C-alpha cells in the first residue's frame, strides 16, 4: 500500500489527574524503513503552553524495527476554571525519511517541494506524488476528552 497510520481509538478519555496520556497508533503494514509522522495538539477548548495541558507538536518516528507508537501528552493542573475539556490530536503527512529514488527521469524543476500534506483534493497530479509516499490509515482524529477526576467508565457515549 504505502502506509497505514491510524489511531486505534478516535476518542480517548483521560483523567485530568493524569500525567502522561498515551494513545496507540497502528503502524504501516509496509514497514520497511524509516517514516516520519508529524502530529499536533489542537487546543480546542483546552490551552497549551503548559496552561491546561502541555501541547505537543512533533514527529513520531516509525521504523522497520520500531513498532507501534504512542503520543505522549502531558496534562496540566487547571489554571482558569474547571471543566472537562478536550483537545484533538491529529497527525500530518508522513514522509519516508529514506526518499525512494523512483526513476521517472530528468524533469524540469526538481526541488524540495512536496511540502504540502495530504491535500490532493482537486489537484490530481499531487496524487501521483502521494501515491509514492506513505499516507495515513483509516481514522486520523483523536478527541481526547480530559475528564476531571471522578471515576472512569462513567463518561459513556
Ligand atoms: Ca484550565
Ligand atoms: Ca480541572
UniProtKB/Swiss-Prot annotation:
Protein's UniProt name: Sodium/calcium exchanger 1
Binding sites annotated in the UniProt record for Ca(2+) 6: 52, 78-80
Positions with a binding annotation for Ca(2+) 5: 16, 78, 80, 148
UniProt record similarity statement: Belongs to the Ca(2+):cation antiporter (CaCA) (TC 2.A.19) family. SLC8 subfamily.
Effect of residue 78 to V: Abolishes regulation by micromolar Ca(2+)
Domain Calx-beta: 1-92
Tissues of expression: Cardiac sarcolemma (at protein level).
Amino acid at each position: 500500500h504505502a502506509g497505514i497510520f491510524t489511531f486505534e481509538e478516535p476518542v480517548t478519555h483521560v483523567s485530568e489527574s493524569i500525567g502522561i496520556m498515551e494513545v496507540k497508533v497502528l503502524r504501516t503494514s509496509g514497514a520497511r524503513g524509516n517514516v516520519i509522522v508529524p502530529y499536533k495538539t489542537i487546543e480546542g477548548t483546552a490551552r497549551g503552553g503548559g496552561e491546561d495541558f502541555e501541547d505537543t507538536c512533533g514527529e513520531l518516528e516509525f521504523q522497520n524495527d520500531e513498532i507501534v507508537k504512542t503520543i505522549s501528552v502531558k496534562v496540566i493542573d487547571d489554571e482558569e476554571y474547571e471543566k472537562n475539556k478536550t483537545f484533538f490530536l491529529e497527525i500530518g503527512e508522513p514522509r519516508l525519511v529514506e526518499m525512494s529514488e523512483k526513476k521517472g527521469g530528468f524533469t524540469i524543476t526538481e526541488e524540495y517541494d512536496d511540502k504540502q500534506p495530504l491535500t490532493s483534493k482537486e489537484e490530481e497530479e499531487r496524487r501521483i506524488a502521494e501515491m509514492g509516499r506513505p499516507i495515513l490509515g483509516e481514522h486520523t482524529k483523536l478527541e481526547v476528552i480530559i475528564e476531571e477526576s471522578y471515576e472512569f467508565k462513567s463518561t459513556v457515549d
